[PDB]
Design a protein around this nucleic acid. Sequence first.
DNA 1: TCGGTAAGCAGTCCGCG
DNA 2: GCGGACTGCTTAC
Length: 901
Amino acid sequence: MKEFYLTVEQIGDSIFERYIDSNGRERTREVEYKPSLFAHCPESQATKYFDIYGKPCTRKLFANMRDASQWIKRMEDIGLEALGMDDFKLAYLSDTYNYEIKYDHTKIRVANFDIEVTSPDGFPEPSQAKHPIDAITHYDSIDDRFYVFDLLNSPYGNVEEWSIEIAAKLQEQGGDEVPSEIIDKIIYMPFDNEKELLMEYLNFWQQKTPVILTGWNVESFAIPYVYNRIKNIFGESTAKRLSPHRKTRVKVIENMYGSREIITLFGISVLDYIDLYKKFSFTNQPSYSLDYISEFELNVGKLKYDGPISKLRESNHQRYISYNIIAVYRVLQIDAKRQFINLSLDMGYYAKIQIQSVFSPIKTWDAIIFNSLKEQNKVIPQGRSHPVQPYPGAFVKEPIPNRYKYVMSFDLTSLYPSIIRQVNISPETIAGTFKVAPLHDYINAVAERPSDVYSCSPNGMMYYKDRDGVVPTEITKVFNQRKEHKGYMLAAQRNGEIIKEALHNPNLSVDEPLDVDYRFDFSDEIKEKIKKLSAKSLNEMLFRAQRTEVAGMTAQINRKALINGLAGALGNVWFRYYDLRNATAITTFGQMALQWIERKVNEYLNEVCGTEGEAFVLYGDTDSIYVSADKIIDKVGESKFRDTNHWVDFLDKFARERMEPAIDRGFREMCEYMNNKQHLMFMDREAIAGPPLGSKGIGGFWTGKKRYALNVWDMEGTRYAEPKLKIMGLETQKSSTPKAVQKALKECIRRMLQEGEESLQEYFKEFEKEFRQLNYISIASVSSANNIAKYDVGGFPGPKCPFHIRGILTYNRAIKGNIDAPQVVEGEKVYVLPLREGNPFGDKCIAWPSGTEITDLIKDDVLHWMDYTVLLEKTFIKPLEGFTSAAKLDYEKKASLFDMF
DNA sequence: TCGGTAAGCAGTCCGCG
DNA sequence: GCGGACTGCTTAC
Ligand SMILES: Cc1cn([C@H]2C[C@H](O)[C@@H](COP(=O)(O)OP(=O)(O)OP(=O)(O)O)O2)c(=O)[nH]c1=O
Ligand SMILES: [Ca+2]
Ligand SMILES: [Ca+2]
Ligand SMILES: [Ca+2]
Ligand SMILES: [Ca+2]
Ligand SMILES: [Ca+2]
Ligand SMILES: [Ca+2]
Ligand SMILES: [Ca+2]
């Protein structure tokens, strides 16, 4: 097999690399890598090296990496550009793996771990590590085993061994319900004392050294805790054994409000799963507890235990250990579903970076572009300092707030990367500038043609047309990967709908789910077999189709994110190729494209309808348009349609056979106007929306920019078994909105769009009557909580104190003098409830850590004093008033002359 | 929250005769 | 009461 790296580090004048050799073995080597950098040279000097602008460069070979770094400094002192890859480990990887890397995940040691630490005096701070580590569960992907290290004797209590037999039993048998499928994979090791536990853990770590290290909050908690605890007990040298090269560094992570410390383990790639999840999941959750996320992702119930976690080991060590094991497994289950580790390996190996660098698109693109240019003996420019400067982005049309009955939407494929490719936007393809007219003049095609030679953007920029720039070349490669995975995602989605349809008529039989590849549209044969399957088999197939859809979604949306990241990286001062000329060329072209096609679509539809100045495009945001289809439907007449699906088919056909060709013609003209390199503005139909045929549903409504709801029957070619609400921006979509309130508002919207005013009024009346019975957590608001300290004046709200911060301050007074009470953590999320006048808490609201029950110390008083009237008005009525006024509907029945009867 | 812009709503403070 | 200036937070793209 072809070799591939696992990890790489620079330590002084050495590269330390762990890798898989040609025989599939893990090896480590130390290499005295001599790096090269570049200076510009006279044209009279023969060279094969040229900078991206075609200027000749001489290669400087250094005796060692320190010399190269010192040279960079002296070049700054002189005032001359020092060209080339200054991150020498990336240059090392580029030289050592000068081919497309094919990696074998089965040879990569991926470790998932979690620790337990009993703490009687509050949160056990990892920088202090003053409490014993009393459990570690460490799963190894190569062994496929959960290694459990269990401390039996501690100053906080001596306990009996954990029982695998009790662990396996149902919770109804008094067991812990450790999943049967991992029971045979547990290797249990009890310890007489913590020193022996940790010494054996380190020996184990030496034998089975993680390449990828993950878990939940491992970077912020588990790793620094283990490191600092071992340091405290044994000294620094022993703690550094967590690194295969015995090198660690405290790294200070800074944000706007303060800083925190993590431990960098040289020769390990830490991918904390909480951070993978935050980056790659495209959710915003009210809590990031593993409990909360596991329930969301897997539909597994909360891990139940009595009393505080600080007393769990002494009261129920059996459950304590089982829950530690289950916690590690839950992350594995989340990854089996989401496949973020797979994604990270794919992207990291593609770019030729340390795997942990996938968190940074700037670093990822720096490496991709460097490797690409190096192939042509081209030389990358030096990174430079730039002041942060604001620049313009997308256009968003102001909609007329209203109901909108029939709506077809259209959206441009991968807009920003497609603009880069079409215009040929790259650092080295800049050709010059032209004199700009107001944007409106380009939109209406009255401005003079910018250039007859170069490819243009309406920001004034001109680009070469003779050859693709490196940015277009490389962005295209990742776009093509994205397109492939999106194809799989949509097939799995369509396949899912086939199965949902079949589930209307399940067969009474005992059978098996079909062995099929859900990434490809089901054949006629598979379809016929599905129609004969039991509900059991169909539901299993549906689960599998949905899992395939999720895998496709991960792979496509994050490749989309990567390529979009390149567009914005051009506007990030830390990117080697930062250039606001290029960043603005993208965004300004985007504004033009949207408003240009708005004009073209209005002109086309006024022509088909035989009208003048009528606005068919009701809304657009960045690269989408929403078209009112009422007039199209009315031209055949609602009474001609057999059912909802009939008019959906009709609009689908109209969009594909009439509108898309018109749109294409409009964009081809725009391409010629800007003299672009290649026409790549592909705007395809997205949604078909409307009320069910014969209903009083309103179909859709807008309240303003980025705030709308549509009843969708078909989305990008997926014809739904049941209509799906597409709601954007409204409170149903906001993590700050109480859970039960999101649910209620969604049902109000569903009724509005599908059933009509009377249905809405019926539901509103019921919700208003019954909502006080809702669990307090389900009706609590949610907010991130920053700068608690800033607004804290002696335990009380300072000037301009935000509402949620006031709530935290109230909580802090109510729990004062309790080291055991859960503390609100700066920067994390809280639940927030309003409090009635005259409550014992002395203020109008209270807040506590999100994803948790409020401490029993104050729970009953919170429940007693919760202000239901305020909560309802703020989170439910006010947003509903907004929806209904926009939709020109009433949520309460108005008096009429009929009431006299 | 270590890892591009546009733009909405909650809430504080305070004006608005 | 509502709206502007401002802070804070959140989502759409
Ligand atoms: C969603 C999203 C969009 N954008 C920018 C870049 C996108 O090209 C542009 C339009 O957004 P989108 O229409 O959401 O995405 P897209 O056009 O890139 O891809 P798709 O084929 O799925 O429609 O907005 C971001 O910068 N970050 C983001 O997270
Ligand atoms: Ca735990
Ligand atoms: Ca798009
Ligand atoms: Ca059937
Ligand atoms: Ca879009
Ligand atoms: Ca098309
Ligand atoms: Ca203070
Ligand atoms: Ca206001």
